[PDB]
Design an enzyme around this catalytic site. Structure first.
Site, PDB file in Angstrom:
ATOM      1  N   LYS A   1     -17.250   5.071   7.043  1.00 27.33           N
ATOM      2  CA  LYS A   1     -16.905   5.113   8.463  1.00 27.33           C
ATOM      3  C   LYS A   1     -17.194   6.522   8.991  1.00 27.33           C
ATOM      4  CE  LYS A   1     -12.918   5.371  11.531  1.00 27.33           C
ATOM      5  NZ  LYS A   1     -11.437   5.532  11.507  1.00 27.33           N
TER       6      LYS A   1
ATOM      7  N   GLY B   1      -2.578   4.343  10.012  1.00 26.31           N
ATOM      8  CA  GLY B   1      -1.713   3.640   9.081  1.00 26.31           C
ATOM      9  C   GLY B   1      -1.510   4.288   7.721  1.00 26.31           C
TER      10      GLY B   1
ATOM     11  N   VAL C   1      15.425  -7.564  -3.956  1.00 22.99           N
ATOM     12  CA  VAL C   1      16.682  -6.906  -3.651  1.00 22.99           C
ATOM     13  C   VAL C   1      17.697  -7.926  -3.168  1.00 22.99           C
ATOM     14  CG1 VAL C   1      17.872  -5.269  -2.137  1.00 22.99           C
ATOM     15  CG2 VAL C   1      15.664  -4.670  -3.149  1.00 22.99           C
TER      16      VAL C   1
ATOM     17  N   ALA D   1      -9.130   1.003   8.179  1.00 20.07           N
ATOM     18  CA  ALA D   1     -10.045   2.082   8.488  1.00 20.07           C
ATOM     19  C   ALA D   1      -9.241   3.352   8.221  1.00 20.07           C
ATOM     20  CB  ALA D   1     -10.482   2.014   9.936  1.00 20.07           C
TER      21      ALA D   1
ATOM     22  N   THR E   1       0.832  -1.187   0.000  1.00 19.69           N
ATOM     23  CA  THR E   1       0.000   0.000   0.000  1.00 19.69           C
ATOM     24  C   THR E   1       0.883   1.260   0.000  1.00 19.69           C
ATOM     25  OG1 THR E   1      -1.767  -1.121   1.238  1.00 19.69           O
ATOM     26  CG2 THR E   1      -1.757   1.301   1.233  1.00 19.69           C
ATOM     27  N   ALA E   2       1.910   1.258   0.837  1.00 21.61           N
ATOM     28  CA  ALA E   2       2.810   2.400   0.942  1.00 21.61           C
ATOM     29  C   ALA E   2       3.591   2.619  -0.359  1.00 21.61           C
ATOM     30  CB  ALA E   2       3.772   2.185   2.099  1.00 21.61           C
TER      31      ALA E   2
END
Lengths: 523, 524
Positions: free
Chosen positions: A78, A359, A196, A49, A14-15
């Protein structure tokens, strides 16, 4: 010197793709971006969330409309986080226990706290409470959300109009895939499937290149570490130390899963649930046709087996056959988020249990800070230090805020809940508490009017947030704000602002469709 | 621990009466306030320069409209501070010397710095300046104010509409007078003209009472010290140490006076002038038919007589007959502004030379903080500590900003100017400077749109302020903001923005009545 020509992002979760998308959009056409990611063992979609500025600070920046990404990520709405059983002793259950005539829950919603004569409504609430004029909980007295949330109402009317602030629930994997497609297809980011093998640094300690298992070497000017907990670049290559924050946060583990759900029969809850357990807490993140749930616990007070059992029994699931994700977190943050030409984004940078849904926020907030402190090839040390300061306080403030959820719980029934009271708060947190007890607002918003990031980031956890959690748990000021005794006209006229919330509560409750009804129509 | 019932203000000057009015309005009907004022020889009306939030944070709070007070206080308009001769060697003259084919001056005005694609216009300016795409000064390129101020235009049309942000110029004595009438006549504040002769403290070290020369004794739950540099309560009675900060600011003195002025023949300047001298600087605060002026200097670099001579010579005044106020002040702040049941407001609390018009601001800003952290008779230690922390940063940040005006001056012609370069900036200021040189903004405003104090107090000295004086003096970033090289679409369109201000300059210059013109009307 000269501008940054090439950027290499290592890690594709996700990041990673959030970074690829944000930097790709920010530096469009002026930098070549490549992302390296290898196949990882797949995990279940246990849910994520979020908070309101995900749209305004991230998707809006990318030029992606709310409806576009929601539909493809099968997202739900939410409106708040419902804290269940944080004030009562007992087993980990999904049902709220009874406390003083009602269910043991309190809401920490997104709705804002209105002022009255330049003073937060929270102060007026407590004044009346302390003097025995009211016995109504803080959240119900000051926000309209609780009532409509107890009835699972939608944050939007069928005609689409919005009545409350809200965020999203969704499977992170779907958002990541949505972004991967957007970055590679619309922003020209190059995706390379490789692992890597080696990171080559120079005599200045900066990264020259990374050699993959296939023998390909990727060189770049700036390296973004999105490798997760492993911290392949930031910790492994750059050797930057990680700061374990276990003296503030006991929770370091989790066992989670996804549960099918019949929305036609039971409807959909417009909120994230944070269910207090015996050695941690459990999240419940409602999605479409299912809900993600995870028991965040402390390995110091429960073995993995015990956590699995407690978690499965709570949901009436078979420990022996239920597909489970057993996770061990790396809780804390690097001493420095950015070192040399290596910037860590995501969990490679920092992590704290998802008790307050930070997050994804930590990712786009940090990316916003990276672009604002964007360097050129000379790597001005000042840009790097300032970036690290913003990241450091962003995290530590959240760390403190979260610890307070446990530190101030009245529970004493298990070794876990008792141990939390034996930890010390960070000096900065203790000062906020001192202020709170003195009747002062904590980081009160300059205005009571999520649209401007710089403002939000600078005032992330505000007075509203602290009252919801603190008052919710039972911690209230030692006495009313002294300033109110000199404002007789104001304390008399609040009766009608508390009246407005009650009317709004009643009218929205009788006119709003259920969250399921709204989802059912939008589809 | 009942609430505070009685408040005693010691000192009845500008700060004293501002405290009386602010507190009287904020606690109206819930506290008895008495102000103890000693009759002593007044000073000349040397003039006060202010900032925009004087109206929104102070007068609006009292419920007093701008027209009501500035008419009764014969006030004029301020749109900026014009820094004259801070870059060229020479004697102290009211006339700008020449520099780079132009007069040695630059403005630090109240105007807002437009953002562009989320980046301060200041950054685009320097980018082009650094690339030789321009040679225009920062203030003229980014602000509309400079050109209409060179023509002494009014900040508002004859029909009354505002075309620019602005503050006021006025004689402090007149405002204090106005505030005394207000507080005593409309807020029930009791005025007692007497001299403090003895302050009795209790076992906790708090003030029990103050006895006057006539033998009267006054008690209260909270004592606010507005006695000026003497610090009769906070420093003398409570024994709280004053922290001198001449290691950051060399100026500790001043020679001042009021000079009659022919407005009909010269018009009225809509700005405060900060004129660099050999051992300090001189202010010029235009009012109605006169202008307050004073030479702020460092006693370690110029003698009182050398200063009066220099000051008189620049204004062509006669030293032997010109009425002159000679002042020596303490620069810095108390270790703590509020101790026990004693709160210091005004110069009894802190002071820094008026180079950026913060004198009166320090008073209502502090009064605002006092009410926000207002206590009850138990005097919660936490409220006092927080208040003290707000005052301390309010002051230290300003102290730092001001030191920067001297530190970054290119001049090396006198011991004074060379001496400023050998002082050291505080760590925080050094960090800000490092950021600036890196192309970063400093305390950039969360928005490009003075109405919300809380927000202003936090972002008091923002990016536009730092650029105005830093770039004005000649200190610019080491290289353009690295981000601009990644925003070709932005650095392309930006030119539109610059043209827009050049347009506004053009129009306002052609259509604005002189300030004098507008002033005549505001009175007649």
């Amino acid at each position: 010197s000269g501008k940054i020509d090439k950027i290499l992002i290592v890690g594709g979760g996700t990041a990673g793709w959030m970074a690829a998308s944000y930097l790709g959009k920010a530096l469009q056409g002026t930098a070549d971006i490549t992302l390296l990611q290898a196949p990882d063992i797949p995990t279940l979609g246990v849910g994520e969330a979020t908070i309101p500025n995900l749209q305004t600070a991230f998707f809006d920046f990318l030029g992606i409309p709310e409806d576009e990404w929601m539909r493809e990520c099968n997202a739900s709405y939410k409106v708040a986080i419902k804290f269940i059983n944080w004030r009562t002793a007992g087993e980990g259950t999904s049902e709220a226990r009874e406390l003083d005539g009602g269910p043991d829950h309190f809401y920490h919603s997104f709705g804002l706290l209105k002022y009255h004569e330049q003073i937060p409504l929270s102060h007026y609430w407590f004044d009346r409470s302390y003097r025995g004029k009211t016995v109504e909980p803080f959240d119900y007295a000051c926000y309209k959300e609780p009532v409509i949330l107890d009835a699972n109402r939608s944050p939007r009317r069928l005609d689409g109009s919005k009545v409350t602030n809200y965020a999203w629930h969704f499977d992170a994997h779907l958002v990541a895939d949505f972004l991967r497609r957007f970055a590679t297809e619309k922003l020209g980011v190059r995706h390379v499937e490789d692992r890597v093998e080696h990171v080559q640094r120079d005599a200045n300690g900066n990264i020259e290149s990374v050699r993959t298992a296939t023998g390909r070497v990727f060189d770049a000017d700036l390296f973004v570490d999105c490798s997760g907990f492993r911290g392949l670049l930031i910790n492994k290559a750059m050797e930057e130390p990680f700061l374990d924050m276990s003296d503030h946060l006991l929770n370091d583990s989790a066992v989670a899963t996804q549960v099918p759900h019949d929305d036609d029969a039971n409807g959909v809850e417009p909120f994230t649930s944070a269910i207090a357990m015996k050695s941690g807490w459990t999240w419940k993140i409602p999605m479409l046709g299912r809900f993600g749930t995870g028991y965040v616990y402390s390995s110091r007070f429960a073995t993995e087996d015990e956590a699995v059992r407690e978690f499965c029994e709570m949901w009436h699931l078979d420990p022996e056959t239920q597909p489970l994700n057993r996770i061990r977190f790396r809780v804390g943050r690097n001493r420095r988020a950015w070192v040399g030409n290596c910037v860590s984004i995501g969990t490679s940078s920092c992590f704290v249990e998802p008790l307050e849904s930070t997050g994804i926020y930590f990712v786009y907030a940090a990316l916003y800070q990276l672009v604002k402190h964007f360097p050129d090839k000379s790597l001005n040390p000042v840009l790097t230090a300032r970036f690290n300061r913003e990241i450091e306080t962003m995290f530590d403030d959240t760390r403190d805020f979260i610890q307070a959820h446990f530190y101030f719980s009245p529970r004493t029934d298990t070794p876990f809940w008792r141990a939390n009271k034996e930890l010390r708060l960070a000096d900065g947190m203790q000062e906020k508490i001192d202020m709170y007890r003195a009747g002062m607002a904590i980081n009160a918003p300059a205005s009571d009017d999520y649209g401007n990031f710089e403002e939000e980031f600078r005032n992330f956890w505000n007075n509203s947030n602290y009252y919801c959690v603190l008052a919710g748990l039972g911690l209230v000021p030692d006495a009313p704000s002294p300033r109110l005794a000199h404002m007789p006209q104001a304390t008399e006229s609040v009766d009608e602002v508390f009246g407005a919330v009650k009317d709004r509560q009643r009218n929205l409750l009788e006119t709003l469709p259920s969250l399921h009804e709204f989802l059912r129509q939008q589809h």
